[PDB]
Design a protein around this ligand. Structure first.
Ligand SMILES: O=C1c2ccccc2C(=O)N1C[C@@H]1c2ccccc2CCN1C(=O)[C@@H]1CCCC[C@@H]1c1nnn[nH]1
Ligand SMILES: O=C1c2ccccc2C(=O)N1C[C@@H]1c2ccccc2CCN1C(=O)[C@@H]1CCCC[C@@H]1c1nnn[nH]1
Ligand SMILES: O=C1c2ccccc2C(=O)N1C[C@@H]1c2ccccc2CCN1C(=O)[C@@H]1CCCC[C@@H]1c1nnn[nH]1
Lengths: 286, 286, 286
């Protein structure tokens, strides 16, 4: 239906909200964020777009965000929701049973292993069991009612490790680590596999993509992206992964590539209006 | 039966070969290595002690070693054997079916994922399938005729990841990662479980100890060591782990702690003649 | 007109500046470099010879160079220019529109993919687009106002890959890879074709030479050199390639071969005053 892209960074933190339509390839110019921010994460619950966490990198100063803002598509306006317990810059998020999980992120020099859950019915955040590892630039994916924290950065080492959360048991456990170390990678779920595209391994931006099969418990490489990129927006729409923007250790990308799992190929389908990195993206449900 | 300690580091790379008898608590001052080195690994095959890889850190310069030297307890003599294909400083080693596996390590700035095997009868090294990850300061453990590479450092990031080698199939496979990131940890096998004691997580030296059960595929913490230590010697003697020396953030340890798995307790049983880190340790077989 | 040879290595890093006249076959002994260096690159802009990057391998210690020095033929004198942003040993250089491009190279352990441009009239360096691959011992050629980075070493593997820079667009594209892997090869342009002579493939020094046709996008072998050589000086003078010195496996070459494209034959036309490798070579324009 539509692929949102909220915020991002180019010279400073951005306030752009734009929506891409895969059918005709048009870009909608929607209402801008109240506060500019990069390193945020986007998710859609009910029929509202949620902008979680982030950081406002401006010439005047840098401020980490604990703000949850809710975009109503009908009115084309943003409405503040209950803020998180702590600011979370470079955050990952996943949705289970209509509840938003705010995973990891940073507050200045404090790297979070803590995770908290938002209940939209109550407008209320509540902390859950923390991760085994501190993760910023973490990628999150939801599969079989289980949340996966994939890769990231613990303040010293970038991570190839991943861990699975069990909502019913309220506990974390380590799974098989990735083949490549990835911080700020695009993580999503397509069919019955966890995907991890792009990222930063400590010295190079990555174009390699690998997927995790839950039953075999093995990470397998697939066709790499055309442009290597970190801090990229990722989204699945009608059986195909879409990756939007990012940073290639150099230029802020406007490129948007699409992955077809049947053919195992990447192809640039469009461009964003301007180059940016660290965007929060989410698809309109259904 | 003796616990050998070869080489090590204190202000410069050491040449010490010393042997500890756990029965009476005595120390034997044996013949020194012909070339001093730290970051080496020790192993015992067919009644002979082998010193593998390492580096000679001296005031006159630094040289990485590809040397395999063989110590005969009967003659108290070091005799050179066939050198490895490439130098391997901060190496890990394991023994399967009388063959010595040289795993990972570094040569100057090259970090090895490559692995090679030594055949004592032929005095020959041959490369096998390389690891999925480049690892230096890697811990090696042999269990059920499979070789496990644990933790380490890839040149940028310290690792909690672990992978298992299959000699018959000649292939590596990533297993469940550790709870803690460990580079230069003491890795050994006790009662059908892989132990990972100490190490360096990128910031602090560790005193925590976790073990891996092969069937459950889970890492579990046990009682921590009294002293934090990285680049530590390790071996098993009559159902108990012996850790020797290491680096705790400033002092080079001479302490030697012993782990009793029944009581789940650590106790300092003896001291080495001088403090050191990066030693090659192996026990006399049987 | 003269073929300059600056620096080089034999036992230690050299300070020689010598100039060969192809007409009468004489050698000119010009003013030595202020600082000895090998792994540098030479180029001529506006009647001035430039010595870029390199390293001073001395008995007292090894130091990588970020220095740009300018030789004035009128005064027979070297003058320091603005240094590069980072030291670059085994550097490659080319010139587009009177601007010197510093491509890749190493700073001790760091292998650069970054590229920076020097403006002689301003005496300023500015970073441009970094390469898709990190390359040390990289050969550079300019053709149709596009800069080509060929072969080299990425810190792990020696490369047969090549890539093309687009100054106006400020981006890099990966072109067709070479038939042979070449690190430290002599790269130049002749009759609208990119040549890659000699180099090191990981095991042996090479005498084979292959050229790239830009329209057909194919690498084709030509007559090989008489001597195998890596880290060789190279240039083009009156429709013929001149390769100077290098390393063949044990002996530092003083040989200077010349390639005639019409006959497709190499021939030793002269010798340098002493054998050396890793020199910077360039021709007085016109
Ligand atoms: O885009 C860049 C970038 C540009 C230039 C230099 C360094 C970086 C970088 O690390 N990135 C990625 C990084 C990143 C990584 C993972 C997830 C989100 C993001 C947001 C973008 N980003 C950034 O680093 C932001 C953009 C670059 C300025 C610094 C910004 C920042 N500083 N502290 N937090 N953010
Ligand atoms: O003992 C120290 C130490 C002391 C003081 C400062 C830093 C270190 C350190 O990293 N180590 C551990 C490190 C290490 C880690 C894993 C496995 C083997 C070893 C050998 C000892 N060691 C070292 O780093 C060596 C001892 C310290 C000087 C540098 C030496 C080295 N440098 N490159 N290779 N060796
Ligand atoms: O000439 C030799 C040589 C001689 C003996 C052993 C190894 C080499 C080698 O790699 N080379 C080539 C190498 C090279 C490769 C590409 C581009 C420039 C150069 C300069 C010369 N050179 C060298 O390696 C230099 C000469 C050999 C000593 C080491 C020198 C060095 N070390 N780190 N940087 N330079």
């Amino acid at each position: 239906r539509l692929i949102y892209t909220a915020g991002g960074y180019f010279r400073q933190s951005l306030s752009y909200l734009e929506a891409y339509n895969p059918s005709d390839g048009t870009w909608l110019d929607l209402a801008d964020l109240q506060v500019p921010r990069s390193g945020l994460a986007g998710c859609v619950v009910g029929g509202l777009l949620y902008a979680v966490g982030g950081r406002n990198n401006s010439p005047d100063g840098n401020t980490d965000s604990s703000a949850l803002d809710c975009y109503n598509p009908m009115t084309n306006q943003w409405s503040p929701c209950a803020p998180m317990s702590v600011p979370r810059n470079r955050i990952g998020v996943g949705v289970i049973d209509g509840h938003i999980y705010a995973v990891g992120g940073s507050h200045g020099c404090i790297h979070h292993n803590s995770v908290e859950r938002y209940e939209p019915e109550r407008d209320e955040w509540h902390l859950v069991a923390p991760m085994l590892t501190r993760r910023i630039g973490v990628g999150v994916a939801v599969l079989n009612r289980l949340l996966y924290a994939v890769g990231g950065f613990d303040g010293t080492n970038r991570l190839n490790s991943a861990e699975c959360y069990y909502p019913e048991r309220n506990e974390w456990r380590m799974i098989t680590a990735m083949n490549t170390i990835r911080s700020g990678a695009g993580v999503c779920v397509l069919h019955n596999c966890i995907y991890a595209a792009g990222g930063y391994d400590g010295q190079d931006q990555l174009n390699s993509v690998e997927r995790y099969d839950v039953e075999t418990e093995t990470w397998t490489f697939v066709a790499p992206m055309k442009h290597r990129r970190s801090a990229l927006g990722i989204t699945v729409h009608q059986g195909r992964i879409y990756v939007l923007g990012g940073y290639d250790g150099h230029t802020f990308l406007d490129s948007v590539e699409c992955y077809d799992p049947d053919t195992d190929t990447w192809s640039e389908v469009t461009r964003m209006t301007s180059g940016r990195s660290g965007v929060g993206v989410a698809v309109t449900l259904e």
